[PDB]
């Protein structure tokens, strides 16, 4: 309605899209808003075969007869740790290791740095709930050298897809306040050697040749013999 695909063109139902608009199509259901989501099933799904031949205990099993060799406990802890990183690393698993809970560092998800997609998140602050690996994480989004004005809750902070890179320059103490990084058009004068724009509003990438080969070898232009 507000923002259609290709204007209204109705010649096929599929011509519209998989959602008619970014905005929620019924007003009584707001969560239908178009987001950028993530494959939660695969990315949670932690490997239970890592916990094979381990002998974990539970939290409330404190019993004397119940617990085990300190060696067994240690390999249990290591097995559990390997079980939690077994997919990728969650933000809160990355942040506890960095100085100042990683305030100021730039957290990029894997798919944000590949292709013409370029995006990351500067961390403004963090609330660890009693359980680590969960929590709330706030920050500034930086997309193609253009930054947010105010901080925002980082979405899918709990899903283990995250990488970052520790720099001492970016570290901020809990006393001070994390500054928003400069949007490259406005605050900092645009420089080519410092930063080059991957992709811009009307651009898109050239055809990678292996895809072309494959599609022609599909549609049956280029032959493929058994």
């Amino acid at each position: 309605r507000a923002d259609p695909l290709n204007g209204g063109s109705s010649m096929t139902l599929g011509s519209k899209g998989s959602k008619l608009s970014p905005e929620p199509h019924r007003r009584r259901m707001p969560w239908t808003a178009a987001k950028e989501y993530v494959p939660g099933v695969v990315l949670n799904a932690r490997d239970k075969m890592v916990l094979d031949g381990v002998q974990l205990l539970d939290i409330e099993s404190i019993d004397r007869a119940s617990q085990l060799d300190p060696l067994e406990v240690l390999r249990a802890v290591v097995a559990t740790r390997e079980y939690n990183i077994s997919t990728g690393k969650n933000i809160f698993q990355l942040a506890s290791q960095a100085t100042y809970n990683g305030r100021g560092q730039r957290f990029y998800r894997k798919e944000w740095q590949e292709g013409t997609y370029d995006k990351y998140v500067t961390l403004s602050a963090i609330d660890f709930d009693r359980d680590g690996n969960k929590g709330t994480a706030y920050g500034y989004i930086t997309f193609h050298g253009e930054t947010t004005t105010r901080p925002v809750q980082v979405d899918f902070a709990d899903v283990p897809g995250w990488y970052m890179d520790f720099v001492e320059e970016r570290a901020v103490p809990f006393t001070g306040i994390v500054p928003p990084p400069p949007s490259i058009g406005t605050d900092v004068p645009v420089d080519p050697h410092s930063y080059r724009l991957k992709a811009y509003p009307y651009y898109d990438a050239p055809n990678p040749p292996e895809f072309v080969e494959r599609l022609l070898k599909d549609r049956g232009v280029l032959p493929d013999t058994p």
Binding site: N6, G7, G8, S9, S10, M11, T12, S15
Partner: peptide, 10 residues
């Protein structure tokens, strides 16, 4: 390709 079609269509 189908965009090409629907251009003329609309």
């Amino acid at each position: 390709w189908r965009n090409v079609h629907e251009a003329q269509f609309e």
